[PDB]
């Protein structure tokens, strides 16, 4: 079945330069339109680039003549070679089969993170919410971890190592007035397994290489 | 070049419910006309190609019509999982162009938030400063308010709040508000209280702790 997996997304200086990788399974890059697209955090879908099968390639208006899209048949991948880059092209980025007929664009990659920025790289804090009475509600209690002060985005939560995965809500992080990241992950689990079974939460900040396992227990 | 303009840019519809969303084109592209489907933090999803044809495995609940600037995608009953935003995109002539979409919330009956709160833990204590969390879990609508006090006092401009994502089957949300205080103001005072106002309530509920 089709895949598309992208790589090279991250932190990047203005005025920098970054390339996406983007390597297809289950179909031929070398005969196939392609396409990035890239949506701003919070806004629409924006297109980027095509090449055309027979290497054609056609530009947005804002990235014609810093950006290049490409490919290497040999390893079925797609790449777009990013330039001079601003803070306007923080985006995610995600690349997508074309169909050169009916020009749709049926199959996507997951997408990858490109923040432009001269801030500093900073790895999260990881402070537990320990459940009490105060977050027992019959049978049911909850507890999380907060994760703190980090850039930039994003940050992935897990609860006992992905084996926790029934009644977990991990929030949308918040900017905070510092220009650093916060958010919380809560997960409400029965009230009676609280002394019989241990609860981790698994906080990963890749931009960074920081990997936190934080125990949480009753206070 | 081409400009792609949706209507409504905001549904709010309940299960069972027949959606349908606009899509003009400033001018004539005959059936090249694609439909996306996106939840948040994710790869659209391509729903239908051609103004009319659906996609491998897209459920026959959403379906599309229209053939030159005006198109619409229809979904005949609306489940819990359909909450997303939903774009119209051409692909007659270059640039490709998307509409700035419709974004389709889950109208549900009312459901009152349950309300719990946290201390600031002892570890984060050692670094000097405190950060105090109200949860809000499971309810509907998204309004709600959130008043933290302070030894009674009411705070202000201290307190972020965040919101998760519709729960895929029951339609509910959650919403986490913190309060930061500096170690200092924290050790200063004893009753942390966190107020909650919502339609589902018939009067302000309030969460608290002593330091």
């Known amino acids: 079945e089709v895949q598309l997996v992208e790589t090279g997304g991250g932190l990047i200086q203005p005025g920098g330069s970054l390339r996406l990788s983007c390597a297809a399974s289950?179909?031929?890059?070398?005969?196939?339109?392609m396409s990035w697209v890239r949506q701003a955090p919070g806004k629409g879908l924006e297109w980027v680039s095509v090449?055309?099968?027979?290497?054609?390639?056609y530009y947005a208006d804002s990235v014609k003549g810093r950006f290049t899209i490409s490919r290497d048949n040999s390893k079925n991948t797609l790449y777009l070679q990013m330039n001079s880059l601003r803070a306007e092209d923080t985006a995610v980025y995600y690349c997508?089969?074309?169909?050169?007929?009916?020009?749709?664009?049926?199959?996507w990659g997951q997408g990858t993170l490109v923040t432009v920025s001269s801030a500093s790289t900073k790895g999260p804090s990881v402070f537990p919410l320990a459940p009490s009475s105060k977050s027992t509600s019959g049978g049911t209690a909850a507890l999380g971890c907060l994760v703190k002060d980090y850039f930039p985005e994003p940050v992935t939560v897990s609860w006992n190592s992905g084996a926790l995965t029934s009644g977990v809500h991990t929030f949308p992080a918040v900017l905070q007035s510092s220009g650093l990241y916060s958010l919380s992950s809560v997960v409400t689990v029965p009230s009676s397994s609280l002394g019989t079974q241990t609860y981790i939460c698994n906080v990963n900040h890749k931009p960074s290489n920081t990997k936190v396992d934080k125990k949480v227990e009753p206070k | 070049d081409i400009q792609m303009t949706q209507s409504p840019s905001s549904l709010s519809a309940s299960v069972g419910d027949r959606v349908t969303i606009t899509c003009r084109a400033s001018?004539?592209?005959?059936?090249?006309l694609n439909w996306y489907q996106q939840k948040p933090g994710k790869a659209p999803k391509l729903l239908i190609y051609?103004?009319?044809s659906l996609q491998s495995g897209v459920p026959s609940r959403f379906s599309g019509s229209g053939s030159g600037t005006d198109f619409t995608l229809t979904i005949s009953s609306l489940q819990p999982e359909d909450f997303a935003t939903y774009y119209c995109?051409?692909?007659?002539?270059?640039?490709?162009?998307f509409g700035q979409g419709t974004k389709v919330e889950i109208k549900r009956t009312v459901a009152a938030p349950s309300v719990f709160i946290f201390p600031p833990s002892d570890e984060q204590l050692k670094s000097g400063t405190a950060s105090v969390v109200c949860l809000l879990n499971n309810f509907y609508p998204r309004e709600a308010k959130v008043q933290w006090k302070v030894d009674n006092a009411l705070q202000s401009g201290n307190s972020q709040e965040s919101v998760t994502e519709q729960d895929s089957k029951d339609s509910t949300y959650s919403l986490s508000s913190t309060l930061t205080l500096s170690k200092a103001d924290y050790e200063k005072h004893k009753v942390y209280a966190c107020e909650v106002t919502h339609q589902g309530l018939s009067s302000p509920v309030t969460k608290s702790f002593n330091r």
């Open positions: 997508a089969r074309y169909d050169g007929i009916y020009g749709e664009l049926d199959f």
């Open positions: 289950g179909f031929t890059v070398s005969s196939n339109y």
């Open positions: 090449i055309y099968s027979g290497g054609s390639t």
């Open positions: 001018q004539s592209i005959s059936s090249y």
């Open positions: 051609a103004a009319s």
């Open positions: 995109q051409q692909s007659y002539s270059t640039p490709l162009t």
